[PDB]
């Protein structure tokens, strides 16, 4: 099998580089964050502008949806996170605690917690209801590039430019495991597989790796793309064929066969680094977003 993603929409709304695009769990919306201090909500199927959400004092590096698709959390250079009522665009909570740029964020599957990573080299765990920081994990020795809950919510995976990938116990905050590469390249992105068994880790040596963190063995390796400078999102595509999907610094979207590790498709259209890619929860739809020279969001549809 081979995917046939084709360009359906190009969304131009941000005046600065886009940083992150995420689909709502209910499949209705796409949220985009940008260096222009703004969040925008679009229709996932038609690209129709729904709303602009503002309030952050500086640029935004990441956004994430709650499981009920009602809340958004955003991570900003203004050292804070913000919890937003999507339907009103009102800031429900301002998460204060980090001492530098907040770079990455995610809700847990229950959506009672938020995990954040920061340029202050720490990973924080916040209570959604009260907005209070529950835990501060002294996670890394460099800016935290990604943070992600497993499907059970009990584990938090984190990555950093320091070369480490860590598995943390959510309940205790203890570093349950530490993945180590002897060559130690900066880890620019990490994410649990949709089964919690593996983690997909990007390193700034033009490499993606599917790791079994338990045994500490690299199961898969995906190459061909360019990634040496930016923290580019990667994804497990599961609605059709089992793909690995990632942006690239050569302006392309790369799609690999997960098992064979072969590049099965390259999506062309962006004219700057494709910093972000996301996969629709139910449909074979990919969203992509690019940096300053581009500033657009693109939606791609495939049959398989």
């Amino acid at each position: 099998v081979k995917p046939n993603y084709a360009l359906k929409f190009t969304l131009a709304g941000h005046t600065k580089a886009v940083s992150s695009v995420k689909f709502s769990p209910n499949g209705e919306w796409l949220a985009s964050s940008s260096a222009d201090k703004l969040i925008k909500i679009w229709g996932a199927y038609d690209g129709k502008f729904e709303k602009t959400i503002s309030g952050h004092k500086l640029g935004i590096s990441d956004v994430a949806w709650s499981s009920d698709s009602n809340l958004l959390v955003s991570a900003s250079d203004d050292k804070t996170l913000k919890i937003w009522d999507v339907s009103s665009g009102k800031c429900l909570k301002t998460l204060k605690g980090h001492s530098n740029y907040v770079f990455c964020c995610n809700f847990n599957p229950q959506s009672n917690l938020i995990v954040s990573g920061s340029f202050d080299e720490s990973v924080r765990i916040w209570d959604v209801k009260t907005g209070k920081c529950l835990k501060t994990l002294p996670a890394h020795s460099d800016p935290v590039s990604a943070v992600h809950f497993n499907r059970d919510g009990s584990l938090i995976v984190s990555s950093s430019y320091d070369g480490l990938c860590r598995i943390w116990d959510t309940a205790s905050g203890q570093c349950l495991k530490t993945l180590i590469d002897d060559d130690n390249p900066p880890v620019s992105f990490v994410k649990f597989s949709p089964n919690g068994k593996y983690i997909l880790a990007a390193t700034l040596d033009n490499t993606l790796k599917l790791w079994d963190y338990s045994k500490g063995k690299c199961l898969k390796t995906y190459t061909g793309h360019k990634n040496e400078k930016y923290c580019i999102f990667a994804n497990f595509s599961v609605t059709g064929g089992k793909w690995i999907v990632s942006g690239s610094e050569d302006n392309l979207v790369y799609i690999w066969n997960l098992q064979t590790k072969e590049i099965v498709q390259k999506l062309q259209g962006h004219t700057d680094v494709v910093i972000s890619t996301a996969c629709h929860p139910t449909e074979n739809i990919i969203a992509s977003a690019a940096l300053e020279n581009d500033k657009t969001i693109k939606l791609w549809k495939s049959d398989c």
Partner: peptide, 6 residues
Amino acid sequence: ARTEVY
């Protein structure tokens, strides 16, 4: 920050 090179 994500849109800039560290």
